[PDB]
Each structure stands twice: as C-alpha cells, then as structure tokens.
Amino acid sequence: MVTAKKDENFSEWYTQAIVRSEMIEYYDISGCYIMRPWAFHIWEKVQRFFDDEIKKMGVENSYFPMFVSRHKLEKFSPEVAWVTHYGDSPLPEKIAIRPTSETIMYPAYAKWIRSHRDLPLKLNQWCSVVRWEFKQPTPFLRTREFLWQEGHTAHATEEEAWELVLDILELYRRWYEECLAVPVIKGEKSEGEKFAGGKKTTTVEAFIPENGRGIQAATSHLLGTNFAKMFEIEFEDEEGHKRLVHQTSWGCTTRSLGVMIMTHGDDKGLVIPPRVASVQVVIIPILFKDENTGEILGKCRELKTMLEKADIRVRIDDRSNYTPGWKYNHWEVKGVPLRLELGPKDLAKGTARVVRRDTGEAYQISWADLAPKLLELMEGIQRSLFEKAKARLHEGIEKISTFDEVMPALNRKHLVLAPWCEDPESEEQIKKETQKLSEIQAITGAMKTLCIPFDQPPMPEGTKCFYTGKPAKRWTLWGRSY
Amino acid sequence: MVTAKKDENFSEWYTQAIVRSEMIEYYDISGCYIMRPWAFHIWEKVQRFFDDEIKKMGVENSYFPMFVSRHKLEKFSPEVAWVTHYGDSPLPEKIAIRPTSETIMYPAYAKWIRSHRDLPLKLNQWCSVVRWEFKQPTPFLRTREFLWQEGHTAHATEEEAWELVLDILELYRRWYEECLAVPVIKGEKSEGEKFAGGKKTTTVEAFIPENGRGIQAATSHLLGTNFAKMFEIEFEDEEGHKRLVHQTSWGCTTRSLGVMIMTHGDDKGLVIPPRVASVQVVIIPILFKDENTGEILGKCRELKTMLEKADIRVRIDDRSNYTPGWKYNHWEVKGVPLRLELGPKDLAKGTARVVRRDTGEAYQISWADLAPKLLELMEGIQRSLFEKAKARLHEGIEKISTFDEVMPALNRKHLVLAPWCEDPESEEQIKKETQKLSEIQATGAMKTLCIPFDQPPMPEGTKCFYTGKPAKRWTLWGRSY
Numbered sequence: 001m002v003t004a005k006k007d008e009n010f011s012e013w014y015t016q017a018i019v020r021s022e023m024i025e026y027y028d029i030s031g032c033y034i035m036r037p038w039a040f041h042i043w044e045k046v047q048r049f050f051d052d053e054i055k056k057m058g059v060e061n062s063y064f065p066m067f068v069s070r071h072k073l074e075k076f077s078p079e080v081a082w083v084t085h086y087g088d089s090p091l092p093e094k095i096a097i098r099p100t101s102e103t104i105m106y107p108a109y110a111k112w113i114r115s116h117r118d119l120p121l122k123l124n125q126w127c128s129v130v131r132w133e134f135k136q137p138t139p140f141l142r143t144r145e146f147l148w149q150e151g152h153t154a155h156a157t158e159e160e161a162w163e164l165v166l167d168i169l170e171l172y173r174r175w176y177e178e179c180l181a182v183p184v185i186k187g188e189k190s191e192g193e194k195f196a197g198g199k200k201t202t203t204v205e206a207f208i209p210e211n212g213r214g215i216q217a218a219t220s221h222l223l224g225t226n227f228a229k230m231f232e233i234e235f236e237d238e239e240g241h242k243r244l245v246h247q248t249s250w251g252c253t254t255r256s257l258g259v260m261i262m263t264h265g266d267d268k269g270l271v272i273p274p275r276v277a278s279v280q281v282v283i284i285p286i287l288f289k290d291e292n293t294g295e296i297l298g299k300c301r302e303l304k305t306m307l308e309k310a311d312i313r314v315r316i317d318d319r320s321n322y323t324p325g326w327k328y329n330h331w332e333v334k335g336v337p338l339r340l341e342l343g344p345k346d347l348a349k350g351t352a353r354v355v356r357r358d359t360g361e362a363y364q365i366s367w368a369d370l371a372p373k374l375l376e377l378m379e380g381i382q383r384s385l386f387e388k389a390k391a392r393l394h395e396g397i398e399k400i401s402t403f404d405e406v407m408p409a410l411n412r413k414h415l416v417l418a419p420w421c422e423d424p425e426s427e428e429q430i431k432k433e434t435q436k437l438s439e440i441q442a443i444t445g446a447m448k449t450l451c452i453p454f455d456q457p458p459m460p461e462g463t464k465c466f467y468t469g470k471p472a473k474r475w476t477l478w479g480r481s482y
Numbered sequence: 483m484v485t486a487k488k489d490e491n492f493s494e495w496y497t498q499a500i501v502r503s504e505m506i507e508y509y510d511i512s513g514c515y516i517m518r519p520w521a522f523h524i525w526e527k528v529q530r531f532f533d534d535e536i537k538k539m540g541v542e543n544s545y546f547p548m549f550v551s552r553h554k555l556e557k558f559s560p561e562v563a564w565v566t567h568y569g570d571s572p573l574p575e576k577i578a579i580r581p582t583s584e585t586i587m588y589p590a591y592a593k594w595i596r597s598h599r600d601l602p603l604k605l606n607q608w609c610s611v612v613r614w615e616f617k618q619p620t621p622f623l624r625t626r627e628f629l630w631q632e633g634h635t636a637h638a639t640e641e642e643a644w645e646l647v648l649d650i651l652e653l654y655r656r657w658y659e660e661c662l663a664v665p666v667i668k669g670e671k672s673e674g675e676k677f678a679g680g681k682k683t684t685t686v687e688a689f690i691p692e693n694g695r696g697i698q699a700a701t702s703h704l705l706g707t708n709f710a711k712m713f714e715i716e717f718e719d720e721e722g723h724k725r726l727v728h729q730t731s732w733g734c735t736t737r738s739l740g741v742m743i744m745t746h747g748d749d750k751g752l753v754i755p756p757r758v759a760s761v762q763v764v765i766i767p768i769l770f771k772d773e774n775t776g777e778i779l780g781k782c783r784e785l786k787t788m789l790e791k792a793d794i795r796v797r798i799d800d801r802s803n804y805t806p807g808w809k810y811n812h813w814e815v816k817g818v819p820l821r822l823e824l825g826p827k828d829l830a831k832g833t834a835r836v837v838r839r840d841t842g843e844a845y846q847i848s849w850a851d852l853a854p855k856l857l858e859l860m861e862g863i864q865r866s867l868f869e870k871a872k873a874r875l876h877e878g879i880e881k882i883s884t885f886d887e888v889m890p891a892l893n894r895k896h897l898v899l900a901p902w903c904e905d906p907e908s909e910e911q912i913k914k915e916t917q918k919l920s921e922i923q924a925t926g927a928m929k930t931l932c933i934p935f936d937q938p939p940m941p942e943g944t945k946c947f948y949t950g951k952p953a954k955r956w957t958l959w960g961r962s963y
C-alpha cells in the first residue's frame with residue numbers, strides 16, 4: 001500500500017509508511033501525533049530494556065510534577081508552553097509545562113543532599129515533555145510533545161560521575177543496536193554544540209542515508225559542579241568540609257522509534273526488528289470467501305499455541321472478505337518480520353511456508369520444527385538488519401583532508417570525517433560558509449559537527465586541520481543534521 | 483520518628499507518614515507533589531500487575547496527546563488548565579491540558595472503525611492528568627496532577643461491553659485487595675453520581691475509618707452508545723447495516739497508594755503489604771566495637787543469596803555511616819515487612835532474629851529454615867493486613883432503616899446501608915439536609931457511595947429510609963472524599 005519510493009520521495013514515503021502501518025494518527029494540533037499500539041509496543045519494549053538496565057545500576061524511578069512555576073524555571077525561552085488560566089480564572093503566576101526537569105528536580109536535590117552518606121543520588125523519570133519547536137515537525141524525530149526518560153545523578157567525585165556517564169552511553173548504544181538494530185557512533189560533542197549547563201557532553205549519533213542527515217540519538221552529560229553552585233547542592237564530606245556535588249544528566253526520547261523506521265524500511269513499507277516487534281509471526285490462513293470449514297483455522301490455532309509456548313508473539317489474521325494476497329501486503333506494510341502461510345496443501349503435507357520480511361526468502365518447515373526454526377530465523381533477521389544497516393552507515397561517511405572535499409561529499413548526501421583543530425570560532429565559520437555555499441548551489445543546509453568519535457581512525461604525524469590549517473587534534477564527524 | 487498518632491490528628495499523622503518514609507516531597511505549586519522512589523516503586527508494582535492482566539484480555543497500550551483544542555474540548559469547565567502562550571507570543575487559539583481523553587480519543591475511534599472486522603477495539607493508556615481541583619488537595623487522594631490509566635473500548639454488542647466492564651472492575655478489586663490488601667465494595671453509582679456521559683457506572687469503594695469517609699477507589703463505565711452518537715462511531719455489521727458501537731471506559735489513579743497508606747499505616751509509620759514492597763526483607767548487620775565484622779557481613783551476603791533463590795526481594799543495609807538502631811527505625815518507618823538482624827551472638831547460634839513490621843512479633847529462625855519460614859510469614863502478613871482491614875470496614879458500616887439514625891451514625895464516623903427508592907431528587911434532598919444539620923452541629927454532606935452488588939435480603943413492603951415510597955435496593959451512603 002506504499003506508493004512513494006523510499007530513495008526518491010523520502011518524506012512522502014515516511015508519512016505514508018507511518019500512517020498505513022497503523023503506527024501514528026495525525027492530530028489537529030501541529031507537531032503532535034497519536035501513537036497507536038503498533039509503535040507504542042516498540043516504545044514499551046525499549047523502555048523495559050533500559051529500565052531493567054538502570055535498575056541494575058541502582059538508579060531509582062520517580063515522578064516530579066509537569067508544572068514548574070515561572071520564578072523556578074527562570075534563574076530556550078521561546079519554546080516554553082505557559083499556563084495562565086484555570087477555567088476563566090487567571091493564575092497569580094504563570095506556570096510552565098515541563099520542557100525538562102532540572103529546575104524542578106535540583107531544588108529537591110539541594111534539600112535531600114546534606115552529607116556524604118546521601119551520595120550518590122541516582123534518579124530517573126519516564127515522562128512526556130512539551131517544547132514549541134520552531135523547526136518544522138517530523139513524527140517521532142521532532143515533535144512538540146514527546147515521550148522520554150531523563151536521568152539525573154549526583155556523586156561525591158567527578159570520576160564516579162564520569163563512569164556513570166559512560167555506562168549510560170553504553171546503555172544507549174545497546175538501546176539502539178541490540179533492541180532497534182540501528183548502528184550508532186559514540187562521540188564527544190564540540191564545545192559549541194554541547195549542553196551549555198555542563199562540562200562535557202557525550203552522545204550517540206545515527207545517520208539517515210536517504211537525505212544524508214545526521215541525527216542525535218541520545219545524550220549523556222558530565223554536568224560537573226556548576227548546577228550544584230547554581231542550586232546550592234552541597235554536602236559535608238568526612239572531614240566536615242562543604243563540597244559541591246558532581247552531577248550527570250542523560251535522556252532519550254521516542255525519536256529512536258523514528259530512527260528505526262528510517263533505517264530498516266523499504267519500498268513495501270516498514271521492517272520491524274523481531275526484538276521489538278508487537279507481532280513477530282503472523283499466521284495467515286489461505287482462505288477465500290464464505291468457506292471456512294474449521295480445518296485450517298483449527299490448525300492455525302494449534303500452531304499459535306505451539307509458537308507461544310516458545311515465547312514468540314503471534315497473531316492469526318483470520319479476517320473475512322480479505323484475500324490472502326491483501327493480508328500479505330497488509331502485514332508486509334506493517335513490517336511483521338515473519339509471515340506464516342498455512343493452506344490446504346500445507347495441511348495435507350504437515351508443513352507451513354514461512355516468508356522473511358527483510359529478504360523475502362521462503363522456507364518450507366514441518367510443524368514439529370516450527371518453533372526452533374522460527375527462533376533461529378528471528379535472530380538471523382535481527383542480526384542481518386543490523387549488519388546491512390551498519391554497512392550503509394559506514395558507506396555514508398567520507399574521510400576527507402581539505403575543505404575543498406566538503407561540498408561534493410555533502411552533495412552525495414554523506415557525512416564527512418575530517419581532522420579538526422577543535423577551536424570554537426572555526427565551527428561557526430564553517431557552518432556559515434557551508435550554509436552560504438549551500439544556498440548558492442540550491443536549485444538548514446549548514447554543516448555542523450555531529451561528534452568527536454571515541455573510535456578514532458589513525459592520525460598520521462603532522463596532519464593539519466581541514467579548515468584552519470592548524471595542527472589537527474582528532475577526527476571529527478560533520479554533516480547536515482536534524 | 484512519627485510522633486503524631488493516627489487516631490488523634492489523622493491529617494498530621496498522614497503527612498508525617500508520607501514525608502518521613504521518603505515517599506512524598508512537597509512542592510511550591512499547591513495540589514502537586516513529588517513522588518519519590520519509595521512510593522513510585524509501589525506504583526510500578528500495581529502498574530505491572532494491571533498492565534499484565536489487561537494484556538491477557540487483549541487490551542493494548544497507546545499514547546494520545548496531552549493537548550486538546552478548545553474547539554474539540556467544548557463541543558468540569560473551571561477545572562481545565564489552559565495553555566495560552568509559547569514564550570512571549572500568544573497562541574492563536576488557546577489549548578487545554580488533558581483532564582481526560584474522551585475528546586482526544588473518540589474522533590480517532592470514529593475514523594478507525596468501519597466494519598465489524600475492527601471490533602472489539604480495546605485501548606489503554608498510562609498518563610498524567612491535570613485538573614485544577616477546588617476541593618482541599620491531599621497527597622495521592624486528590625491532586626491537581628495525578629498519574630492514572632484510562633482504558634476505552636468499543637464493541638459490537640452491549641453484552642460484550644458489559645462483560646468487559648465487569649472484568650475490569652474485578653481487576654480493580656484484585657488491584658486493591660490482592661496487591662494493596664485494601665478491602666473494597668463493588669457497586670453501581672446512582673443516577674446523580676454516575677458519569678453523565680454514560681449509561682451505567684460501576685465502582686469500587688473504600689473506607690477511611692479515622693475520619694469515617696468513603697472514597698471511590700476506581701471506576702468502570704458502561705457508556706452505551708451516546709458517545710457513539712456524538713462522535714459518529716459506527717460500523718457495518720455482516721448484513722451491511724450501519725450500527726453504533728457500545729463503548730466502555732475505565733480508569734484508576736495513584737489515589738490507590740494513599741488508600742493503602744491510610745489503611746495499613748500505624749503510629750510508627752508505614753506498613754507496606756509484602757506483595758507491593760520493593761524490599762520485603764532488609765538485612766541489618768550488628769557491628770559494634772569491632773566484633774566479627776567480616777564474618778557477619780559475609781553471612782549476610784550468603785543469606786541474601788539463599789533468600790533470593792526463593793524470589794524474596796532482599797536488601798542488605800551494610801551502609802557504614804548509620805548505626806543499627808538508625809537502620810531499625812529507618813526501615814520500620816519506611817514499612818518494610820520483615821527485618822532480619824544478625825549479631826555476633828546469632829552468628830554463634832546459627833540463627834537470625836526476624837521482626838515482622840505489622841505486629842512487631844520477633845522470631846528466632848535457623849539459617850536453614852529461613853526461606854520457607856519467611857515466605858510463610860510474608861503471606862501471613864499480607865492476609866492478616868487484609869483481614870484486619872476487612873473487619874474494620876465491616877465495623878464502620880451500620881445497617882439502618884429510617885433517616886432518624888443517619889447523623890448519629892455519621893457522628894460515630896460510620897457509613898450507612900439504607901433501603902432506598904433510587905429517585906434522583908431524593909439524593910440531592912438528602913445531601914442538602916445532611917449538609918444543613920452538619921452545619922447546625924457546629925463536617926460535610928452525605929452522598930450515595932454506591933449501590934452494592936451483594937444486596938442483603940429486601941423484605942417486601944420495606945419503605946425508603948427518607949421518602950417512604952417502596953424501597954428498591956440497599957444503598958451505601960456516607961461522607962466522601
């Protein structure tokens with residue numbers, strides 16, 4: 001049911017795929033979207049994964065209110081949604097809807113932390129967040145209301161905080177790679193792109209090859225002690241000296257879902273990795289109009305039970321007045337990784353035909369071997385989905401030496417890996433220059449740093465920065481961005 | 483550390499209990515509170531239970547926006563919070579924050595449902611809700627922002643919808659009685675208290691004896707078809723005929739947590755039922771003037787291992803910067819069901835000292851018999867908490883037959899089970915009268931709490947306790963939250 005081609009009209013393909021797969025429904029308020037069960041199940045799955053992992057690290061869940069009074073929020077402004085009335089009565093002070101929870105949580109932290117006995121404090125909350133985005137909205141990727149988790153920790157030393165920052169970053173890599181089969185690059189944000197309220201910002205970056213755009217998948221901040229000075233979060237150490245806590249913060253949103261969609265979708269529609277898919281195997285009985293004698297649906301129900309015994313999430317599409325081909329296309333558009341076809345011949349030979357969504361390959365499998373084989377296949381699918389994706393990621397990055405190679409590489413919708421001197425003036429200059437050169441070619445075009453990757457390619461002695469010509473410190477990943 | 487006592491100043495005791503147990507933090511905006519880990523973990527337990535149970539029923543989770551246009555919300559009004567500005571710029575049209583999701587979900591239902599092949603449609607969502615309550619706020623019980631689940635379903639027939647209504651209400655009874663050990667009464671609301679947009683409203687009701695006030699614990703509505711008329715949610719049946727859907731909606735909130743605290747809390751603080759306790763057994767090593775520190779700690783570790791192999795959620799408070807008595811009262815005010823103490827003497831005896839939070843009784847238990855005796859004790863604590871609460875509930879209800887006994891019973895902080903004619907005018911009459919007499923005595927009006935499913939025998943010719951016409955059914959009235 002997907003008519004737009006993915007590599008040609010990418011935007012139309014995306015909107016079509018997310019609507020026709022029954023994942024999102026559009027809404028009369030711009031930038032907001034209904035998340036239907038088909039996408040919300042994926043959200044629940046990654047949420048359970050991340051929650052278990054952070055509970056293993058001693059992180060505890062909380063809920064702080066979504067309203068913050070004006071005087072507490074102010075001590076970014078154009079994006080804040082303000083409540084001024086309840087009914088027709090005006091409030092004595094306008095209250096903001098949560099754009100993030102620093103100004104709600106850190107006063108509580110100031111109260112709760114007095115002693116070194118109170119450290120480390122590790123809190124997380126799953127919640128919704130409202131920001132009146134000026135950029136044009138994209139479902140999942142950039143929405144005016146989005147779901148996320150935000151974690152905030154305070155420690156007695158910077159080293160423990162940095163350790164937690166890196167552990168959370170690894171959990172985000174697993175979120176994207178183990179759950180969603182999306183490859184991401186760990187990296188350090190530049191000083192012009194890092195969270196201004198912190199010391200050092202780490203990130204995972206993903207790549208959309210259709211439009212050649214980089215996107216920040218999740219963020220992890222070594223905040224340091226300036227939030228503690230601002231909010232007076234102090235503690236007495238063992239000697240009795242007052243000291244500031246070292247803080248970290250980290251967050252990840254439903255944007256991940258969108259990334260996943262863009263990574264694995266094809267011309268037929270979605271491809272949902274088996275680890276997060278709401279239905280892993282849909283059983284489609286080959287039946288036409290008004291002649292269901294009970295044989296085929298009976299065997300389909302027995303097979304559903306046998307598969308569910310193996311923890312496989314299974315649905316039987318037994319709806320009438322739909323041809324089997326229609327159902328095939330329906331569940332292919334939805335992205336079900338495995339399709340089980342059971343017809344009269346399969347009933348006669350004790351077999352079933354299983355089709356992979358990602359490659360289309362078919363398999364004849366006897367009933368007795370259904371649960372093992374399918375399990376095998378699912379992992380295969382998952383792994384294949386990652387591998388191909390990573391290949392595409394790596395084929396979208398160009399190593400360059402000079403600024404002359406920037407604009408061609410950008411026009412091939414590629415990221416650029418370049419030796420960079422890392423001084424802050426150079427990034428502003430490079431953004432302005434690439435934007436001007438983008439407009440003069442034109443028949444949001446600015447290139448900024450996406451990350452300074454932890455995984456550094458070799459840096460030969462005497463390599464100069466691709467822009468200023470100063471000695472080059474590290475390889476930096478640049479590109480157009482969301 | 484709790485010093486106010488539950489049968490003297492109930493409000494002071496309540497806030498002391500929720501603050502000192504590290505469950506609630508007060509917030510500058512009145513009516514809103516910070517849920518700290520200790521309370522949010524209990525919320526997570528009951529959420530997991532209910533989510534699993536409704537997923538067995540084929541209900542699926544979703545998420546609809548929290549914003550509704552003024553257009554669609556106004557097709558109660560003083561409770562709606564309005565967004566009017568982003569930054570400094572005013573919105574062209576103001577936007578409401580979700581007080582409930584009917585006006586957000588039901589247009590999508592009209593769009594999604596076309597045929598009988600789409601029914602039943604069963605959606606649920608866990609979200610927060612904002613209502614600018616005029617009543618005096620109470621942490622958990624009545625807040626301006628609160629967490630809930632709201633489920634909405636659409637069926638082809640009224641039979642199926644009503645069966646789902648009853649299933650959901652049974653799930654709420656299990657939520658309160660099986661997890662929170664809080665006894666509740668199933669019933670239906672009078673026509674003056676039911677959800678005005680629906681046909682029949684079922685409910686479960688709890689009772690706070692210290693102020694004698696009933697409280698609606700959860701609700702489950704048979705909406706009928708009027709919402710289908712209003713939003714045009716119609717489907718073709720197998721004969722090609724266009725029919726309206728029969729809808730249900732149900733919801734329940736963090737209020738349950740409060741009803742737990744007021745139910746099992748005593749003068750030493752909280753008592754958490756073991757089924758919802760993040761920590762069921764806390765292990766406290768006794769270390770003093772350096773005696774057997776390492777051996778005590780090692781056997782604490784292996785005791786934790788042994789107990790977790792039986793699925794017992796165990797925490798070892800080996801924190802060095804706190805004294806054993808401090809840990810004692812910390813975990814006692816927090817409400818942990820069992821405390822296991824291990825000193826040098828018990829290290830020699832091969833035993834451990836176990837104190838149960840609810841009754842305070844202590845046991846000397848072998849290291850070998852620890853797991854089974856602790857599981858026995860945990861289910862004993864859970865069942866006895868429930869049974870004591872059930873006895874208190876039954877003692878707070880007085881069967882009466884004439885209005886002359888209402889306000890006496892109301893003054894002993896009791897509910898009234900009275901025979902009633904079920905006439906709408908009668909209930910407002912009764913509430914205004916009870917209001918006037920409560921004022922004359924100087925604590926609030928009296929309303930119908932519910933009409934219980936388990937009806938006592940109604941002898942023929944029994945008269946309504948207020949009007950005098952033939953009494954239809956036994957109705958539970960009282961003062962309410």
Ligand SMILES: Nc1ncnc2c1ncn2[C@@H]1O[C@H](COP(=O)(O)OP(=O)(O)NP(=O)(O)O)[C@@H](O)[C@H]1O
Pocket residue numbers: 100131133140141142143144146216217218219251252253254255482
């Ligand atoms: N409107 C949005 N919708 C969905 N996800 C978002 C949105 N804004 C930010 N995110 C994600 O949330 C993560 C943490 O939030 P945050 O650090 O506040 O983003 P940010 O600083 O506003 N970056 P950006 O808005 O893209 O310039 C980001 O790394 C994004 O992946």
Ligand SMILES: Nc1ncnc2c1ncn2[C@@H]1O[C@H](COP(=O)(O)OP(=O)(O)NP(=O)(O)O)[C@@H](O)[C@H]1O
Pocket residue numbers: 582613615622623624625626628630698699700701733734735736737963
């Ligand atoms: N402010 C609140 N805080 C906590 N729980 C609430 C609040 N309002 C309602 N609830 C609970 O949510 C359930 C479903 O909400 P709802 O039916 O809209 O309550 P309601 O009609 O407003 N009744 P009430 O406001 O108490 O007169 C109720 O049965 C209550 O148990």
Ligand SMILES: O=C(C[C@H]1NCCC[C@@H]1O)Cn1cnc2ccccc2c1=O
Pocket residue numbers: 076077079080099100101102131149150151195219221249250251252
């Ligand atoms: O949200 C953050 C910082 C961290 N907050 C905790 C979770 C991870 C996150 O990166 C950045 N940010 C983004 N957008 C805004 C809009 C309005 C007001 C404040 C902000 C604002 O502060």
Ligand SMILES: O=C(C[C@H]1NCCC[C@@H]1O)Cn1cnc2ccccc2c1=O
Pocket residue numbers: 558559561562581582583584613632633677701731732733
């Ligand atoms: O929310 C309900 C009814 C049901 N909604 C679905 C979930 C279960 C719940 O009982 C009732 N109500 C209560 N309070 C309001 C305040 C403002 C606007 C609308 C309302 C409003 O409608």
Ligand SMILES: [Mg+2]
Pocket residue numbers: 131
């Ligand atoms: Mg932003």
Ligand SMILES: [Mg+2]
Pocket residue numbers: 613
């Ligand atoms: Mg209300």
